[PDB]
Amino acid sequence: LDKSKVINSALELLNEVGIEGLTTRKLAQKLGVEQPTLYWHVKNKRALLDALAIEMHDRHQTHYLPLEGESWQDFLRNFAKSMRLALLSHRDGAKVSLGTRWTEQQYETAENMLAFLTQQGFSLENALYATDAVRVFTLGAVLLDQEQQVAKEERETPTPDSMPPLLRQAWELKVHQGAEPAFLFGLELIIAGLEKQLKR
Amino acid sequence: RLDKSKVINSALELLNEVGIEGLTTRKLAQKLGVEQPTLYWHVKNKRALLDALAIEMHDRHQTHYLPLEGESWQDFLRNFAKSMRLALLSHRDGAKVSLGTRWTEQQYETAENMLAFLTQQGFSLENALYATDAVRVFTLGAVLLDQEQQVAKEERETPTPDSMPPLLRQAWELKVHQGAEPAFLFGLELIIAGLEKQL
User: What CATH number was assigned to the domain covering residues A65-199?
Assistant: First the structure.
């Protein structure tokens, strides 16, 4: 039993039962091993969630650092876009990420992210709030997305015809578009707000 | 007899006691001293209860869906965001409850006037829709994040601040001492500012 086997098995389990269903007990049972053997790999549900989130961001290369020559705008754009995929990678992927924080091992990454932004002329405070603005919007979009998927299968489906015109057009927009353009537009609002902030 | 009014008040109280994961129509029946069939009429299942809960929450905290006479659209969206946030914070797991809702038919008039108001300011319907959704998901995400992080720190060892590098240390300091509101108001302002440019 190696860590990577635990995590891969845990991710399949997350798909099977979702975040609320997930327990070390079930992961032990899935792995075909005893409780105490698993414990050294993951001591409790929280550690299990932490490791799952590390794996998802790692596997889908969430873009925490700028590439050479990348503007700060493109950087934030790619942080959001890649984080979005990573969270979408798995059932309740956003809920699993929601509670994480930088590990010690990622402190250098975390510091480079802030240094990069402060080198553009942002104060530290603004660089933080910029980072969180994008994280929060991205977590929120996908939490909204993943929850509505589930809520849809649990209530009457609404009639287009009962809806007033502007509401009905907005319903239509979303089926014409899917979720991607709404997310891109929100993301641009933040960048453009950030651009004004950076002038001041 | 059981009126819908008591069902939802009891439900709001139960939500505070056991949170969203412990909420079931069964426990709600039990708390009311009624059988599951008697409750069925008011609330068919868990989803309908969550939906009835979110409407009530946003109603009693007077979430700002409609403009005050003369209010700019910037202020409208600011009051929408802030008031929404108020309602989510006023109830245990309020944002989780709110997360999976949509407009009901009773709210269609509100919902339509909201879009009508934004289009009269010169936003296309498309932009009006995305504007509101942007504000809504940013708000939901800000509260859900902040809640989850406090729960999480309880379930984890506590990191030594001094083991953090400088800039990250300062970011942590700002967060612990300022609370959650400044990040929220800052992100809200980036969105308004982005929306100004679009128009």
Answer: 1.10.357.10
